[PDB]
Structures are given as C-alpha cells and as structure tokens.
C-alpha cells in the first residue's frame, strides 16, 4: 500500500523495481512522520529513491500531494509513501535498502528501538541488502550514551542483525536541521539530548 496524493493504491513488487531501477541507491525511513524530512532528503539526492513508512496515511497527505506534482512545482520522482507498520512490514521490501533510518521515534516505535524488540527489529533488518548502513536516533525525557554503549544493548542488536559502528549525543543544534514539525517542536523547545547509534547491518 502507497499513496498517490490522498489516495490509497498498491504497488505490485515488479512496479517497485521498475522505479527503483533508474537509482543506484535506496533508503527507507521507517515511521517517516509527516514526510518532511524524506522530502528534504530526496530533493538534496536524486540518485537515491527514498522509501517513508509509516500507518498513519493521514499525516502524510500535505507532502504526498506536493511530490505528485510537476517538478517545477515541487514534485519529486524519487520518493514513494508506504503505509505499513514495523510489525507488519511489506514483503516487497525486503532485501532492498542501502540504508535504513528511525529518527524521533515515539509510541510503539519507539519502544522496539530502546528496550529492544529483538524480533521487530530483526524485520527491520530483513528489508536491509547484504550491505546496508543504519541510523536510530532517539530522543525520551528533556536513556543516555552509556546504555546505548553496553555490551547488553550491542548483543541484543547484533542478534536482530545490527552492528553498532558508532554511538554519539547531539544537540538542539543538531536537530534544527530536520524539517518535520516534530522535529522542529523537538529542537526549539527545551534543551534535549538526542543519541544516535549507527553502523551496518
Ligand atoms: N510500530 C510502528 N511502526 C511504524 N511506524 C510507527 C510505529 N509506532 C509509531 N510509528 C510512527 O512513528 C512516528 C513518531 S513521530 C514522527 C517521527 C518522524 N520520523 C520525524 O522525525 O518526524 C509517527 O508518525 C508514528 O505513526
């Protein structure tokens, strides 16, 4: 399931690949919010066809009907909205992203990238090709570097099939760059730390 504007339509597997084929990169940004951040990723890359899940099609609107239309308009050909949650993603994904990102997650999301949900987020790991670059950034109160640090959290993502390569603490300053609303209320309000861990899958 996609959407085309405000409309709901699917996409058959051989349909993505045709799109994919005129890219020699592809990211998916799961629980991508209201598509503002994919936007300004894929108009700063037309080399890369950016992939933004999320359930909520209703989010999604203002930005899916902005990239349906003509270039010189703001349309992008490049980015395609898929409504599909963590715990039931697409099987037409798999084993098809360069690299995967979970930015600002909340609720449920949120959850599975923390505790972790090993199982969930070795789905996330399925639609990941053999190489494969990750980022999670997370953000909770206004937990800390040395949870995402431990032996324990590495293990349990190593067994969901990801690698931690790197561990940082950004800044309000750091987020300003996002533009989704949520990352902007995020940036602007109170001083917050934000904890990225990346690597490879
Ligand atoms: N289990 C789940 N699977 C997929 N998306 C989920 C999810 N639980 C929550 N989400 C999505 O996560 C988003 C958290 S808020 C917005 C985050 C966005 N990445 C940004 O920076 O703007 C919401 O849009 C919500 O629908």
């Given at each position: 399931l996609?959407?085309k504007?405000?409309?709901?339509?699917?996409?058959?597997?051989?349909?993505?690949?045709?799109?994919?084929?005129?890219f020699?990169?592809?990211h998916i940004?799961l629980?991508?919010?209201?598509g503002?951040?994919?936007?300004?990723?894929?108009?700063?890359?037309?080399?890369?066809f950016?992939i933004?899940?999320?359930?909520?099609?209703?989010?999604?609107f203002?930005?899916?009907?902005?990239?349906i239309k003509?270039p010189?308009?703001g349309?992008?050909?490049?980015?395609?909205?898929?409504?599909?949650?963590?715990?039931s993603?697409p099987?037409?994904?798999?084993?098809?992203?360069?690299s995967?990102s979970?930015?600002?997650?909340?609720?449920?999301?949120l959850?599975?990238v923390?505790?972790?949900?090993?199982?969930?987020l070795?789905?996330?790991?399925?639609?990941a090709?053999?190489?494969?670059?990750?980022?999670?950034?997370?953000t909770?109160?206004?937990?800390?570097?040395?949870?995402?640090?431990?032996?324990?959290?590495?293990?349990?993502?190593?067994?969901?099939?990801?690698?931690?390569?790197?561990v940082?603490?950004?800044?309000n300053?750091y987020?300003?760059?996002?533009?989704?609303?949520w990352?902007?209320?995020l940036?602007?309000?109170?001083?917050?730390?934000?904890?990225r861990?990346?690597?490879?899958?």
């Amino acid at each position: 399931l996609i959407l085309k504007g405000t409309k709901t339509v699917d996409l058959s597997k051989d349909e993505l690949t045709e799109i994919i084929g005129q890219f020699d990169r592809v990211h998916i940004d799961l629980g991508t919010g209201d598509g503002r951040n994919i936007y300004k990723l894929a108009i700063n890359d037309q080399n890369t066809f950016y992939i933004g899940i999320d359930p909520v099609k209703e989010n999604l609107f203002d930005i899916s009907k902005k990239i349906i239309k003509k270039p010189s308009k703001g349309g992008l050909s490049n980015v395609v909205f898929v409504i599909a949650a963590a715990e039931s993603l697409p099987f037409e994904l798999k084993n098809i992203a360069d690299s995967i990102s979970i930015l600002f997650p909340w609720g449920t999301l949120l959850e599975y990238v923390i505790k972790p949900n090993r199982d969930i987020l070795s789905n996330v790991a399925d639609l990941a090709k053999k190489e494969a670059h990750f980022e999670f950034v997370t953000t909770y109160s206004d937990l800390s570097k040395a949870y995402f640090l431990s032996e324990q959290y590495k293990a349990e993502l190593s067994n969901s099939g990801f690698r931690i390569d790197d561990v940082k603490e950004l800044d309000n300053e750091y987020v300003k760059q996002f533009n989704s609303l949520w990352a902007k209320r995020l940036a602007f309000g109170r001083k917050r730390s934000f904890f990225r861990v990346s690597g490879h899958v």
